[PDB]
Paper text:
Specifically, I. sakaiensis adheres to PET surface and secretes a unique cutinase-like enzyme that degrades PET. By hydrolyzing PET, the enzyme produces mono-(2-hydroxyethyl) terephthalic acid (MHET), TPA and bis-2(hydroxyethyl) TPA (BHET). The enzyme is named PET hydrolase (PETase) for its PET preference. PETase adopts the canonical ɑ/β-hydrolase fold, in which the strictly conserved catalytic triad S131-H208-D177, as predicted from sequence alignment with homologous enzymes that exhibit PET-hydrolytic activity, is found on the protein surface.
We then used the inactive variant protein S131A to prevent ligand hydrolysis. Indeed, S131A variant showed very low activity comparing to the wild-type protein. However, attempts to obtain complex structures using the S131A variant, which crystallized in a C2 unit cell, also failed. In both crystal forms, the R103 side chain of one protein molecule penetrates into a surface cleft next to S131 (or A131) of another protein molecule. It appeared likely that the R103 side chain occupied the putative substrate-binding groove and prevented the substrate from entering. A comparison of the wild type, S131A, and DM crystal structures suggests that these mutations did not significantly alter the overall protein fold (Cα root mean square deviation = 0.144–0.2 Å).
Residue numbers in the entry: 1 to 261
Amino acid sequence: NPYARGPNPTAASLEASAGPFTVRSFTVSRPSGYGAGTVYYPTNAGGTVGAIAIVPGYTARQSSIKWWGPRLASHGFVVITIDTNSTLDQPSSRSSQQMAALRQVASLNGTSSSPIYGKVDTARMGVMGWAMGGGGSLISAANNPSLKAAAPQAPWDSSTNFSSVTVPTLIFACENDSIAPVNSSALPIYDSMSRNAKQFLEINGGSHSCANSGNSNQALIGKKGVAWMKRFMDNDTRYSTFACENPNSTRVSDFRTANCS
């Protein structure tokens, strides 16, 4: 597998705060099409790596989803976390901005003067995000089927029919979400997808911010996010077991998966 990076994983290595690669980061000087961004990247990765763009929810900023930057980058990805043009941007706008962030990562990859010149395989991209940013990630996936993976958290959109999504999609849900309730939001969205590899992981007792920075379930959430991205973005079947497993955990109140391998 030409995309495989790093050593064979274990549950403990995936549950730790960081993976095997050193992470460097920089703030984007001139954001193109979004408000602000921070790029996280691995050093001495052993090859080009995929890129992931992460967008927050309504009223929120990078801080809400920042943990994923070093968490994912340390396992071999270039990650861009963004602030939107406005904190009041809706899901469609968030999707457009998420794609603009991936675009800028691609721009930086091809620009001789950037720190990440030649570090990215621009044909391998992923999308993540929280709440309206989760809805945005799903819209991105629906409109851009070449994306290799999606892993939104506590997603919301005004529509729940995401049957057009063919991208491998993992949905993190928060059991006690009162903003985007699981039964009216995450679950119907999940249930609408009939054409892809998909997964649904619901966090026991979780509020709407249960997958955000500083959360108490980073061991599990981070393991699953990294495993999903590794399996689908890198086609790395060393991660199939972790990507597909139904975790035996009291931290999980519901688990669903389909077409996973």
